[PDB]
Amino acid sequence: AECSVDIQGNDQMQYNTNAITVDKSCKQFTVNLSHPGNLPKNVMGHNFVLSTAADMQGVVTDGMASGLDKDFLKPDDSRVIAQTKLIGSGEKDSVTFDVSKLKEGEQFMFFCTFPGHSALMKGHLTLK
Amino acid sequence: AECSVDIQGNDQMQYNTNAITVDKSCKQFTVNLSHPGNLPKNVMGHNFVLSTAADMQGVVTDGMASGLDKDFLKPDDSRVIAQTKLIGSGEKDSVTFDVSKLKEGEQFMFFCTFPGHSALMKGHLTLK
Numbered sequence: 001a002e003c004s005v006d007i008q009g010n011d012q013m014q015y016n017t018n019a020i021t022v023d024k025s026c027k028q029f030t031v032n033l034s035h036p037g038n039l040p041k042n043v044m045g046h047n048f049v050l051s052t053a054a055d056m057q058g059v060v061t062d063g064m065a066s067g068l069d070k071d072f073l074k075p076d077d078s079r080v081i082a083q084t085k086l087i088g089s090g091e092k093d094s095v096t097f098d099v100s101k102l103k104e105g106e107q108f109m110f111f112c113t114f115p116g117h118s119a120l121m122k123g124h125l126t127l128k
Numbered sequence: 129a130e131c132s133v134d135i136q137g138n139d140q141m142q143y144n145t146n147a148i149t150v151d152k153s154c155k156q157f158t159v160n161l162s163h164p165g166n167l168p169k170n171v172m173g174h175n176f177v178l179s180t181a182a183d184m185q186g187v188v189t190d191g192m193a194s195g196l197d198k199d200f201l202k203p204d205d206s207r208v209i210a211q212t213k214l215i216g217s218g219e220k221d222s223v224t225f226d227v228s229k230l231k232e233g234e235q236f237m238f239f240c241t242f243p244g245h246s247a248l249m250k251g252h253l254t255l256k
């Protein structure tokens with residue numbers, strides 16, 4: 001199994017994937033985010049944020065409260081398993097995390113915390 | 129002996145759990161849905177409908193258009209892995225499905241298809 005995934009967020013507020021499977025043989029897993037299109041970060045910025053499904057709402061809400069300067073993410077949010085920077089068009093960011101941070105049979109979600117974006121920019125991650 | 133879950137939908141349009149883990153050893157899994165509370169089926173009816181995460185939106189949208197008499201579910205919808213009937217207060221219904229219909233490292237959701245309910249009445253199902 002590949003221990004990485006490449007994901008795009010675009011100018012239509014979409015990710016190009018909404019499911020990630022992480023094989024238990026991976027020690028680490030890398031998410032490579034990019035932003036095709038031409039809208040800048042202050043209007044259409046995207047991140048990739050990974051938490052338990054149960055933690056997503058608090059992460060998203062506290063991210064909105066943290067504002068654009070903090071990449072719409074609460075600093076040192078302990079619920080965040082992995083995060084990229086908030087990127088604008090033509091940029092890219094990668095995050096690597098330890099697969100040991102994923103428990104078996106637990107539900108994970110990934111999402112963008114730019115306000116409003118998680119309506120569409122969300123997806124599910126499991127172990128395999 | 130642990131191949132079932134009890135779930136409730138109430139008058140506030142809430143399930144009492146949003147995460148189900150199915151033991152990979154179970155041949156069959158049973159969901160026992162009940163409706164505590166006081167509102168009838170045509171106002172606050174609930175079902176338990178299981179699909180892949182990817183299929184939830186289409187099941188929900190097509191169910192809305194099917195109407196109350198068809199339990200707000202498209203007939204013979206091949207995306208539905210398991211469904212209870214739509215129940216009103218005091219009523220109960222169970223569904224048993226084959227665990228073979230679930231795959232590892234794949235994302236399932238359960239939800240109610242009564243119109244509007246799935247924004248609140250939804251949850252994630254995984255294998256352990």
Ligand SMILES: [Cu+2]
Pocket residue numbers: 009013044045046047112113114117121
């Ligand atoms: Cu975004």
Ligand SMILES: [Cu+2]
Pocket residue numbers: 053109124181237252
């Ligand atoms: Cu979900």
Ligand SMILES: [Cu+2]
Pocket residue numbers: 137141172173174175240241242245249
């Ligand atoms: Cu309902």
Ligand code: NA
Pocket residue numbers: 001002003023025
């Ligand atoms: Na591999």
